[model samples]
Target: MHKDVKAIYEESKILDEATHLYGVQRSDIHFIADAENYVYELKKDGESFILKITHTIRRSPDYILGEMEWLHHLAKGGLSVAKPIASLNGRDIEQVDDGQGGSFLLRVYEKAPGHKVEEADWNDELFYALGQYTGRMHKLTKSYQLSDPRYKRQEWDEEEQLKLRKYVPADQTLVFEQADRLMEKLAKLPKNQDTYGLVHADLHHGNFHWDQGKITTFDFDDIGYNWFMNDISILLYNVLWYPVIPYEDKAAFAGNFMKQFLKGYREENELGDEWLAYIPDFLRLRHVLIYGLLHQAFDLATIGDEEKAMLASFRSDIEQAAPITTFDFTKLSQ
Candidate 1:
């Protein structure tokens, strides 16, 4: 979450109205991390749900409604997504006057059945399950059509992170140049129903839950139309950022992970192994995208040493066009 959004939420009485709309009591609202929006755990009648309050400045109602539609689609497709719930008025979305001329969008989702990957005893087996989970989602997306075109989401390039200048300072000239070149390259890729559709643009481990061998995903706020490779890349990019892992070991670990991953993925859907080759390039693109998002999420002047070190590494990589990791992606093909 951006700092300003948190401050605004605290300074206003919008939470009361937001809870009222969702049919949850204010006392039941326990603050979760403001990772993107104001996330909270809401409890009602021996059950729990996740409530999100996002500002219009962060995302429009249509963007979120579009997400609601996709979640419903996935749920009906027998995929175990964290399902969406409508407000008390029987609407999937509600508006709370934020007292700043802008409104706070409110929505609730089912609390996923289990713990996050980090909370579980993770291993290569879990990565395989994740692949199966995502493969099912991509397969479902292949047949999905907009129930109402007006609720449609914008495509990949329209992402806020792509608006680098809006967040990144102009002094970073190489960053913008690098981004433009990457944009041109990715824009020319083969896009068809088989490879492109509305996808979970950010499927990092943090956004999903693992129960026994089952995976249940949540946080579709970054959903967009893009190649399946983009979704695959986002997961790999996040996995390699374990922070404790030695940089030199990423390639070996990823090779093992992707082997199991692709096997599980191919069991559900058929994406040509050729798409795996772009995973490295897509990793670089995510590097650029997250760097922009970092600038939005942090005040660089005040961050601690660890934060500065991570930011510096990303900056150096962006300027030098360095690989986040290198491995023979096609070698993992099933």
Candidate 2:
């Protein structure tokens, strides 16, 4: 963990006060995970919940509230997702003063029902279910209009493109140059209602749970305005990278997965073959984003050998301008 983050977590007493707002005791809160936010597992009166405290600097209060609003809308639209809980004072969001001019935003969520699918259990059914869920969200987004400009989200554009340079190391100039080219090509794509709108920008398996045959997704902190194809590309990209999936056969695996996933997705929404052709383009974009994020978030000096190897692989691919994985949409049933 970063020293500043660790120090803030230890001395802020934010968690203690945050529990009070939910009518829970500090002892009931146990550290769960930390990425962009400090996540805690809260247990009170035999009920389980999640307490997510994010740095104010990372996301503004309005951004956080917009995420909550979207989650509610998704739930109402019949998708399974973590439900937000209001504070004891009935506010949708809570603030914790860090006593250092900085603050953290706090929100409680009903723990998503079901356990995450283990690597060994990943199969066509799971892939189809994931696609179905994504398609449903996209279909609903077509009719979604922002009611308040205060909650406006950022667009994935040149601004985000330029931000990539700051996180990449100086030695990785090849990767930066390739990302610049990819962004240029992406800029020429269509942005109609069917192709672009709100998306779960981070839809990897970690953000969802699989219970029996049902999937419940959570973690909307990364939601933004982007292409629906971008979401699909991210799903395929992460699945191909799973260690259990054979690297040598990634192309075939991706083809099979996309075939089943798109089938399920078509049940709820329509994605044309013309749009499917851009999957590789979006996959490359996701690679760039992930590479930059890995370097930005983690302390590379302390990462384990496995993580180091993964980073090395990303660097090699970017340097070579290689696609993360290749998929032949021609293989899809006509």
Candidate 3:
């Protein structure tokens, strides 16, 4: 999802290998967004599937295998996840040589049944449903043992993009100063059975699909060991950033949405009430994380006003320790 990687992806024969190894026509592999991965959708005999090609720089082969292992566990636990598919050789991940001497990792998944839900159709019921589904995964994770310790994923703070000095500009001491403050507090947060575990750290609505009522979550690339409270707040942050929702209404919408979501979340698993106090902190965490990620994901030097303002606000937010929205994060908790 960085610059120059797209050109590397285009020149590589990975797709030709994708055709042969997965038994799909190259033409059927249609272009899709490049948010964190080289994502493509391929069809065969009317059955649609998604193929994401990840560079070793983005994720190691073992990291992705661990992710697939988690996906399988979630599916078997009866969570409606986008199921991981094995290659013809009966392996979850296949590899090809990157022209730059690293490896390109590929995996296929069963496409979720429905398209992204419309904004008008997003209501409390869907919020509750998403919460219920997320709760089930958390409950399952409390008991999940790794198939192999070698397949283990990293923790939340250890994510590669968090290397602020590498990505952010030298002049942006504000990002550096504030992020250090956040990480120190993050390290001190209590990690009890009810508070911390593996989580879908990036489960925004765009990463899942909606059927009549069922939601199938996918894109487990950012999966990491983090607090359950952090996981839930990621969803809350997603709703706050809904483009059509006016800035003034975000607080009201977020409060209403949290009540419904937390209501459903409690039905499957339990968390200490004290954990609710940290939702705003994790929103601040998201602001810092994404601000750093954007610095790596795009060339910010010559962007237009819209993105410039967006990035400008991100740095300012970090400097001021601002969360993504103005909601009293704990008020709506059931």
Candidate 4:
């Protein structure tokens, strides 16, 4: 056990609870990484489950609580999701002392069952299902309301936009500055009211699960108020990121998948014609977000040449706005 694991165990009283609920003596803990959060999988008596340990303090509790509430509500509305297991006190959240300056907060989620999709397995049907699932989630959550004190939707203000600008590496500041100017121009465009609603804020491949030919989804960690079209834009970004093949092959895959995805999304959400036009701007936003991450992770002095090359490629893409494109949806369903 890492020293921090001991702190988490001692603070949250996980061992006793593990014995009681899982019928196994808790023995090992392993960390798994997603994008924004740290997940720890606990193993006991040959059985295991994941514990999501968030970096944020109690400040984001309402978001998590809202997720739990929304998950239940959506499940009842016939959406497939991983059911949340309540804690001993019937609350899903339990606080653990980090023994550092801050305490770690933990939430136990019933791990969804399935394997992630491989590059070769990418097909139109799977894409359509993913789109349909997202549409269903949006439909269910759109009308749902939460009374949690922390339920305010996240907004993009000047300060927030500035932080994104700060993410651009110092040398590459010019491209970001140009993009900021473009964003100002885009801000004047009317919002896509038909496409904006309660959306699964993060809908990448990792967050989705599949079983018996049916798609099940969860992970509302990133859910908040935003232009609903942003979710589809994020999905497009995921498609372009980490593709395990040649660029042309990746483009072919994205084209097919996007066709079906847009079809299903339109069927349920009824996106207007203007939704496609804003996709390019959203794509640029996603690219910069990824660039910001690379800027934080890499150092020119210590990083490998391969990483630097990748970063340069990302920089060129962002600078040229190469990946941004407006999808043609008139043929599908407008």
TM-score of 3: 0.90
**Deviation in angstroms for 306 in model 3?**
2.6
Q: Can you write out model 2's per-residue Cα lDDT over 1-334, one digit (the tens) per residue?
A: 3456567765237866886788988778888887667888998899888988877656789988778888778888898888898899997789888778877788999888789788677778877887788889899888777879999887877334346667766777777788788888999998989899888876777787877778888777778888988888887787777634465677888888888888889888887678777888888888878787787777878899999999999788877878766667656744
Model 3 Cα shift for residue 310 (angstroms): 2.1
The reply for model 1, stretches above 4 Å from the true place, is 1-13, 98-101, 118-120, 243-248
RMSD, model 3, all Cα superposed? 2.4
lDDT string for model 1 (1-334, tens) is 6666776775237778866788778888898967667788989998889888888888788878889999898999999988889888988888887778888888888998888666335676777787888899999999888988778888988988778888887898998898889889998899998889999898777887877767888878778899898898888888788622344677888887788777778878889878988998899999999898888777878989999898888888988889877888988765
Q: Is candidate 2 or candidate 4 better by TM-score?
A: 2
Candidate 3 per-residue lDDT, tens place, 231-289, comes to 99988887678633354677777778888888888899888778878888888888888
Query: Which 10-residue span in candidate 2 carries the lowest summed lDDT?
Result: 156-165
Q: Decide which is better by lDDT, 1 or 2.
A: 1
Worst 10 residues of 3 by lDDT: 242-251
Residue 247, candidate 1: alpha-carbon lDDT: 44
Per-residue lDDT of 141 in model 2 = 83
Collision count of model 4 = 0
- All-Cα superposition RMSD per candidate: 2.6, 2.7, 2.4, 4.2
Candidate 2 matches the true fold with a TM-score of 0.89
Candidates' C-alpha lDDT = 0.83, 0.80, 0.82, 0.63
